[model samples]
Target: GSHMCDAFVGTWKLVSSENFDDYMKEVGVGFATRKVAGMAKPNMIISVNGDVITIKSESTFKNTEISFILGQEFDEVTADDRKVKSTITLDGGVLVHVQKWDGKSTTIKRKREDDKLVVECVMKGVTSTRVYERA
Candidate 1:
């Protein structure tokens, strides 16, 4: 039997983080600001129904939402709140999110790697990845 693709549908707590500050620095944020952002815990809400997926990252510092269709394209704002046009695809069992902003770009690919859900954010000149275990 095939499992429901909606297994990814839910609100997930951000228990821990890695390389967040480095990513912030690469995005041009200063040291003091990056320090603050790195300390805050961000909660991620993912709504998946059929081929449409809506992702929202909420925290004390910032809140952002991204909506896209599998194998289709869309536009959204980045963590820094900059406008970005993007596309999404499913590679193997993973969701690949590619974004284009201000002539630069980034790729956020997500998949269930082992017991943890892995989200890899790759940007031009910067890369930060995070993993989440269901809470």
Candidate 2:
């Protein structure tokens, strides 16, 4: 458990992404908002102490942070302004999250790949993947 947890305890910078705009649009984001969000270069700082974990996302347009226990559900107000029930858990070597709002669902997974964090986000059949390098 410590090994898996250790892999996530660092800062990562968003490097590249795909299909993020449509994923946001499926959740009802406005065109202007999506345009700005699409251009965002978010840096995620992850901290873990025991089972308590915090993820902080910082960007030019907006920033948000949340802390939660693995396997416990909590309310999350997303950067896109959607309030949802969210959970984070370790699945194999990946950190996974499920966010649900108004019966719609979004999933995100993060896995360490050498010097980068490979993040995959999926919503409404549109899949967006982002790569973050350790910083």
Candidate 3:
């Protein structure tokens, strides 16, 4: 087995033109969502929180995170919104992680409301309004 460095624990990407659409389709992923999911270049974000490990898969379209308890199991709701029993383990000396789910979204807008800067976070179903002092 190969002895890897600590730097290897960080987020990494070694593939481009990665056809996630076809790969997902073969594995039974939705057809309508494939186009948006397949095109973006996703970066893997890896982090260690004490004894727990958090691996984040992020892209322009969606993102997913998996918490690994030393290659153990957990009830995870995936990016596809599929709740399943998930496991994160090793295949040789490399770290193996898996997870998914989806989100609504957010957009921040700033405007001068009277005298202070008003910040508004716009979402799909709701528009959250917040006020600022002078920032």
Candidate 4:
């Protein structure tokens, strides 16, 4: 039988955020910029079509979108001001994105865990993860 995963597709409100400073810092964000980003509530929207996925994060400060295909290569701009080529896959009902940029590579895995959609971003030497719950 075929199962539909559309239940996971929709706009999700940003109930709260954690470890903004560390995340910002990992991306080489400064103190002032990190402070501002920490105060801004980011809203995320996710859409999935078969093996294709698109995610958009919008806030009072900025709006950014990322789109990629599952098991295929793509490009992305990280917060640390680095651009990378990447790929995505599904792991235990989770979407995992692996990126390679500037001679370095990282992986970002997303899954619905504990009533929240968790996104775990892993760089070669560091990993920064965030979670988002429904509105």
Clashes (backbone N, CA, C under 3 Å), per candidate, total: 0, 0, 4, 0
Instruction: Report the candidate with higher TM-score, 1 versus 3.
Output: 1
Rank all candidate structures by their lDDT, best first, as comma-separated numbers: 2, 1, 4, 3
* Candidate 2, 1-135: lDDT as tens digits: 555578778899999998888888877899999999899999999997777899999999899999999899999999989999999999997989999989888899988999899988888688889999988
Best candidate, TM-score:
2
Residue pairs that clash (backbone atoms under 3 angstroms), model 4: none
State the displacement of the C-alpha of residue 62, model 1, in Å, after optimal TM-score superposition: 1.9
The C-alpha local distance difference test score for the whole of candidate 3 amounts to 0.51
Give every collision pair in model 3.
Answer: 78-100, 78-101, 79-100, 79-101
Global CA lDDT computed for model 2: 0.89
Q: In candidate 2, which residue pairs get closer than 3 Å at backbone N, Cα or C atoms, i.e. clash?
A: none
Q: Residue pairs in steric clash, candidate 1?
A: none
Rate residue 43 of model 3 by lDDT.
68
Error (Å) of candidate 3 at residue 54 is 0.7
Winner on lDDT (2 vs 3): 2
Residues 20-105, candidate 4, lDDT per residue (tens digit)? Answer: 56755665678887887777777789887666678888888777788877678777775444687877777779777776755655
- Against the reference, the lDDT scores of all candidates come to 0.74, 0.89, 0.51, 0.71
For model 4, state the Cα shift of residue 49 in Å: 3.2
Candidate 2 RMSD to the real structure: 1.3
lDDT of 3 by residue, 24-103 (tens): 55444597666776665566556676667776767787788777675576776555556666555544433443432243
Alpha-carbon deviation at 96 in model 3, angstroms: 3.6
